[PDB]
Design a protein around this ligand. Structure first.
Ligand code: 402
Ligand code: 402
Ligand code: SF4
Ligand code: SF4
Ligand code: SF4
Ligand code: SF4
Ligand code: SF4
Ligand code: SF4
Ligand SMILES: [Zn+2]
Ligand SMILES: [Zn+2]
Lengths: 626, 626
């Protein structure tokens, strides 16, 4: 969109007269007259500087590419003549917030959008080559590329430059100048500007005050730094749990921002945008709008999303019910293969819904990848169902539906960016919007959840049970799994559906269940330190468990890194959020995941039953050692 | 090709009269009249049985798919009426040597080849759907698929069945009947019939006599079994070193066979087929044709390949020279970063040319993946150069060149099948032919290397030096690296280019070099047990090394699993092969890899220098933990 700011008529009206058009990261894009004695930095100052005081990165010359200016030309006087022939007297300014891969992808999209009509008709000859460049760059931005694709890009740039008779080629100059950025993108899977939402790493920005709170809160000691000076996160060992983000008092820890992508997706005509809301979002987002912690404002969130333009507002608790339907069956199978089976079974089964815990177990303790449940997280279950069933039966391909996840978690971005959750470069979750980002969007759009009217959530993939809503707090996943599993194992319905002992706030909680003729020993872990301790206990064998639920954040997803900062006592606020989830559970007529009519309909119409072939193919995934 | 055995006229001439056409795995394909009382097994017996006494797997009904028969119908009488309408009275027989994925890929290729002309014109509507099925099946056969692709195939089969008004769909029935085979292909990356050359696992066949030689020779204790009964290889922990294959007296250990693929590729018109020959092949293939071990018959091999139809006969020793040019520069860089540098450097550098050793270090000791050289093996260096430079400059795309590697190694098939060595599903090495397979091809084609005339190897990618030819025997890689590196480090040329101490037959050999003002401590390992021992010593720190060359086979590639079985004393025969390689080295005017004119031309024209950006992108790769 940065390449369509100025029209061709108003660009060509600047053929002579020293007036130039300026866009990009300038505060006030427009057409200004550069004075006689003026440098590039003085031009930027005449434009009002850059968006967020970011340093200058590069500057494209003309809508038809005419080279990049760099920091070496920043202090030098602006030399004319760079607008040699058939190039508009315009500059697109790049700051340290611009990824060169994303910039070139946008440039190729702009070229293709011109070729689709009469403009830039001579570019039809290089259409296939620029399309292949776009595919390679998309693979780079998705982290599914290789080093040899740079050589392929070199060859493509050579081919396009020769047959276009152009003295500057954007691919060739990008390889020459930002090779370090391209190499970082490919080898490190890291986008240092965080524009590639699939390559986002937690980076401490320059506004760090060096208080050490992030270092203290880090469970894996991934953060190095000293008092009163900037800290650094080792993204290689980072689990993306987001504890540092919550602990940071100055919001110096960034993990990307898909707000711009979400706004463009909503404003794009004929683009179907659907959203799924995590359980913990509805009990924390109201604190910014004047609600007490634990108040259920999911109706207000749905109304705000629909006002923003979301076509379908759904709930991740539906996917939570589906995940429980899979996981309880898996637990029953592994329990039957333990009593009447043999040693080939693996116990305890571990919840796989937390992506930070999955990343932790894939990085450290890589030999335990077959212990956690193969079932996908509720977000990914919902996403794959929506892409493969709901959209298919309403006549939309996977590329025609934009599935946005509203999550309280930093690591949900990484989970959505994982390659196995994608088909033909189309990911099941297009991107993740945090609770903080949604709060900012609502505030900037004038939406106030306190006074907005109530709106219903779409029922086809938004209907959920109290077992599915308790996911957002610690112990809820295992409580729902127990609710669904023990009732079918014993044959009778429990009078008290709430299982005490699984609840509480201890770092690790042990519960023993005596229902029926089978005894289940259940563990719950709050943080990644507790997860590591219980993994060590599992390896030692000093204590035994039948099923363990693991969370990366203290208190569950209500304490997630994407949640708004709490007020007063953090423990009290998190407990209030958990109690709000419990009240939502108590207010629901259906409190068992297997009673969910929509999930049952999915099973009877599309799959066959939990742990069937189709159920495995869609709702189950695999892990990879790191 | 199995679907084009009978013409449409001779298939439709069997409309009535009980005569049926039979092809597939039958010994004598043709048209026979089934008697009144006859079962499917009796029909197969009337056809002469199956090719290699393999068990019956399935039977396709009609060239237009009309269902699969299975073992349950094998003992039952052949029921007519299965040729309902618009289907030829023919059966294609599948044995236990037929992969269902390959069979369906061939069926879709046959359908597309019909659609390209007037026949099967009504199938044009499902062309895109069957093409997507073919792409999914190709991804499955290449090991780059997922479980959800089975759900995609289900949807595609539903779509094609409905709009074709067909009562049998091959994709739907394959999912129903061979789901276990499909699941094995996807999850285990294993083709139990070994038809998918990218998913080949070493499998002990039924002709095992249980002598235990494979179990004794296995370095990682991967083989289980008892005396006088069949043994089994745990392909998950298998390193593909091929020691068991060499030790097997009855050839019961199979690792696939690309002979049929090679023959079809050679017989295909307008198909450019090129070959690269490993150094160890030329000193061992003559033993089967009446030459003493160590005799250089590369001229005879080139003549035989050209008679078979190979368009370009090249040498892997050229890629060995290129690999030395990269590796000596890398060793120099890491040595300079050790003396004048700091602890961030990693020593000793380990050779990465052996794929079995690479698989061993990726499976066990997964934290050491950054220790071995990032440089590709000579085979992959040659393959990527041929695909990206030679073919590009002679006007051939990567899909128009069939690059065949003639190797003495089982693990070379796995290396060629690795996904990182491919672009857009086109692998740099299309497939690997072993020395035994080439011997069988020559014998079956009437080619006798003893009396065939001499022919020159193509010089553009076949010219090589004595440093490149010694690769095939133990210590040769490190000897060539030393030859290229020490001369540039010291500035003067050595009078004696052969480095003693690196040669010999000890399991682990330690050599200390005092040339110049720098001292290099070099280790060489024969087998994977020695490699594991030296890894343990490296971790302990009891001894230090500067560079270590690792081989998986005793004696180097001359003792590779794909080599013909030796006669007399195995040690004496392997030493004779090594001495033959040494004599070839001594007979060459150029004995340093950096003197190779073709490699130098590649560096000055296409790359820039060793360890440049383009050199890294093309000739360097990465490893993945398992
Ligand atoms: N996927 C998923 Fe979860 C669900 O349902 C929601 O989205 Fe959590 C919340 N709230 C988050 O973030 S993830 C871990 N399991 C417990 S809750
Ligand atoms: N790649 C490669 Fe090798 C080379 O050159 C050849 O092909 Fe070997 C042989 N002979 C094999 O097999 S691999 C290991 N390094 C030594 S030699
Ligand atoms: S995210 Fe969790 S792991 Fe990564 S730095 Fe912040 S605290 Fe440490
Ligand atoms: S918490 Fe925020 S401010 Fe305090 S040190 Fe860590 S990053 Fe810098
Ligand atoms: S606990 Fe919930 S919030 Fe914290 S990381 Fe795991 S999933 Fe995201
Ligand atoms: S190949 Fe090497 S590793 Fe695999 S079984 Fe034969 S001997 Fe053991
Ligand atoms: S060597 Fe061949 S025959 Fe002897 S046991 Fe191993 S596999 Fe069976
Ligand atoms: S040594 Fe040569 S033959 Fe034996 S495995 Fe390694 S590469 Fe293949
Ligand atoms: Zn990026
Ligand atoms: Zn197969």
């Amino acid at each position: 969109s940065v390449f369509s700011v100025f029209s061709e008529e108003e660009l060509k009206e600047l053929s002579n007269g020293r007036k130039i058009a300026i866009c990009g990261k300038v505060n006030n894009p427009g057409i200004i007259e550069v004075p006689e004695g003026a440098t590039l930095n003085e031009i930027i100052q005449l434009c009002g500087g850059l968006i967020n005081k970011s340093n200058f990165k590069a500057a494209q010359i003309g809508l038809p590419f005419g080279g990049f200016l760099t920091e070496d030309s920043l202090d030098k006087e602006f030399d004319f003549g760079i607008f040699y022939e058939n190039i508009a007297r315009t500059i697109i300014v790049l700051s340290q917030e611009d990824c060169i891969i994303q910039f070139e992808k946008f440039y190729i999209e702009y070229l293709l959008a011109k070729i689709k009509d009469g403009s830039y008709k001579n570019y039809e000859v290089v259409k296939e080559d620029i399309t292949e460049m776009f595919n390679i760059l998309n693979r780079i931005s998705k982290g599914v590329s290789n080093m040899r694709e740079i050589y392929l890009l070199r060859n493509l740039a050579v081919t396009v430059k020769s047959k276009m008779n152009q003295k500057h080629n954007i691919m060739e100059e990008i390889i020459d100048k930002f090779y370090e950025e391209i190499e970082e993108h490919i080898e490190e899977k890291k986008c240092y500007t965080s524009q590639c939402n699939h390559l986002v790493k937690l980076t401490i920005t320059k506004k760090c005050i060096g208080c050490g709170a992030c270092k203290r809160a880090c469970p894996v000691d991934c953060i190095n730094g000293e008092l009163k000076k900037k800290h650094e996160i080792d993204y290689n060992r980072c689990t993306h749990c987001g504890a540092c983000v919550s602990a940071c008092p100055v919001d110096a820890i960034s993990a990307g921002d898909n707000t711009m992508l979400f706004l463009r997706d909503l404003a794009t005509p004929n683009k179907v945008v659907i959203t799924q809301m995590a359980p913990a979002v509805r009990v924390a987002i109201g604190e910014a709008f004047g609600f007490e912690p634990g108040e259920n404002v999911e109706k207000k969130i749905a109304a705000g999303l629909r006002k923003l333009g979301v076509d379908y507002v759904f709930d991740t608790s539906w996917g939570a019910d589906l995940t429980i339907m899979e996981e309880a069956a898996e637990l029953q199978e592994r329990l039957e293969r333990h009593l009447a089976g043999d040693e080939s079974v693996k116990l305890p089964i571990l919840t796989s819904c937390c992506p930070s815990w999955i990343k932790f177990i894939e990085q450290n303790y890589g030999d335990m990848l077959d212990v956690p449940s193969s079932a996908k997280s509720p977000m990914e279950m919902f996403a794959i169902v929506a892409k493969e069933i709901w959209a298919k039966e309403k006549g939309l391909s996977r590329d025609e539906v934009t599935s946005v996840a509203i999550m309280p978690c930093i690591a949900k971005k990484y989970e959505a960016s994982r390659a196995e959750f994608s088909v033909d470069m189309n990911y099941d979750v297009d991107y993740v919007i945090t609770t903080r980002e949604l709060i900012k969007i609502f505030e900037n759009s004038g939406i106030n959840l306190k006074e907005i009217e109530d709106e219903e959530i779409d029922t086809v993939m938004g209907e959920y049970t109290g077992a599915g809503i308790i996911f957002g707090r610690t112990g809820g996943v295992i409580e729902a799994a127990t609710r669904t599993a023990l009732e079918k194992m014993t044959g009778e319905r429990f009078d008290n559906i709430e299982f005490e002992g699984l609840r509480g706030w201890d770092g690790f909680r042990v519960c023993e269940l005596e229902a029926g003729d089978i005894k289940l020993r259940i563990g719950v872990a709050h943080g990644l330190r507790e997860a590591a301790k219980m993994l060590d206990k599992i390896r030692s064998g000093e204590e035994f468990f039948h099923a363990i639920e693991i969370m990366a954040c203290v208190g569950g997803c209500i304490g997630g890194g994407g949640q708004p900062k709490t007020k007063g006592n953090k423990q009290a606020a998190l407990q209030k959020r958990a109690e709000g989830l419990n009240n939502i559970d108590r207010s629901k007529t259906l409190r068992r995941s297997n009673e969910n009519p929509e999930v049952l309909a999915i099973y009877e119409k599309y799959l066959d039953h939990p742990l069937s072939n189709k159920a495995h193919e869609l709702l189950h995934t695999v892990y990879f050692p790191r």
